[PDB]
Amino acid sequence: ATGGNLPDVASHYPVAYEQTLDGTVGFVIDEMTPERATASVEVTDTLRQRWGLVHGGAYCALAEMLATEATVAVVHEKGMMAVGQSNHTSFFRPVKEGHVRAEAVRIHAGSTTWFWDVSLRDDAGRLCAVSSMSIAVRPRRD
């Protein structure tokens, strides 16, 4: 993938970017390293709930994809697969418009689990939400 700028670790993918939830809501990966990665999204109605605010699930999802793909970037080539195992997001301040910018910092890279701390900020740079992401790492069945 390179539409959302997801790590290109494979020749083909089951689902194309524009068709996934990520593509649908417009998540885009910016920087991506083994210990740190970034992504953002422009707020539109698609990202909000009926009350006009960025949906709680929006932050969870951004954090989810980011931490997970960040792990994938390293282990895919190592014959492993990585999937979110636990996602704990806490909401500090709501976002009504602009963007949401996420920064994932790796804190632990075990053999079966990697852990990332994700920060989600608004356009003013305020900390609106955080997510503790736990990623299971395993060998691809395929």
Added chain:
Amino acid sequence: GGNLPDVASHYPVAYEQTLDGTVGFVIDEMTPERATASVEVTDTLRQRWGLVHGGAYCALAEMLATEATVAVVHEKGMMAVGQSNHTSFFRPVKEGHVRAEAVRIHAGSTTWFWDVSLRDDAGRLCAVSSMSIAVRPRRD
């Protein structure tokens, strides 16, 4: 629309435009202590790898738990928003449906807590979410 609680005359975002309406979440039952919702698995719900996005489960539970709280407190001059969402993934979903069930466990003055269960078409437990909802007096 998604059958969310009708508590106000106007909503800033129409269902079909919201994240919920975009992925297709629908509320089935709704009582003060328990609520259910579901969605058909489509690609809008998946990640590039073909599985239901972890964030989808998160979003389902979030809306369900929050909306079930709103259903009660709105009429009381209060607002409800998610404050914490902890989702744990036990088994992946490739296709079909995702069904959630929210069971209220605590209803405090400032916080409501709900245990949400997300099952696949076989009835298997695919994920869980502990939803913590902040309850506060509505702002003018």
Added chain:
Amino acid sequence: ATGGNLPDVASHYPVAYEQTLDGTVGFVIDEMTPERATASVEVTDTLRQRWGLVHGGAYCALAEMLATEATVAVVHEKGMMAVGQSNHTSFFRPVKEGHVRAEAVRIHAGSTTWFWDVSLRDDAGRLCAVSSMSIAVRPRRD
């Protein structure tokens, strides 16, 4: 062990009950099955914080030991080891005195992780706290 009524899965243990944190604070396992287990403790100062209430960590620990030992009861004999991997405890109502009674219900038993929902109640039966416990299961290095 049988002092705190922990599962006797081994001939010997590195640390004796009365000397562990559990023995020290007085945790006692009541019922114990593959899908469900119970334990309680009598509140004393040892369980409280300076302000007179049951220490937040007290609930976390009870839940921790219970879920973990409950898993141990099944897999030890299977050559695995089990350790807490994640413990998420939420506090609803404080306890000043009496007991804390915990009930762990198994919700997921995977090959690498088991998950238990723990309820912690007071003497009136009120729900004072809950803990989501995630237990890693692995083969004993030894």
Added chain:
Amino acid sequence: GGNLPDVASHYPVAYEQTLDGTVGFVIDEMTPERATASVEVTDTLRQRWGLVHGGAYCALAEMLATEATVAVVHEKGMMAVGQSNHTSFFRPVKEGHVRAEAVRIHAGSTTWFWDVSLRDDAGRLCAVSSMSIAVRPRRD
């Protein structure tokens, strides 16, 4: 005693009797945005298997995050208590010490959030705890 914040003239439980004093927790630094504490590993801190009890890490973070909040809000007529404690375990501790560092990430009117890091004598990250503290007006 454990060097907890001296904010009141009387405390219902003396340090040495509390859970904290029993296992040996001690506050080292304390500022509004950051605090540290530590404990010597002894058997009172371990489980039957010889490792530091998961609950010990939980307890350390709990007290640290809560007490660092109290340090500020008490004098303001408020009370602080843990509302959520999520501890994740990365590497076990058999002996030595456990050192915690709490970094304040959010300070709201009703909720303060702290990221706590628990390291072993080698400085390795053994566990983390996300502490959510409820802040409320003190009761008469």
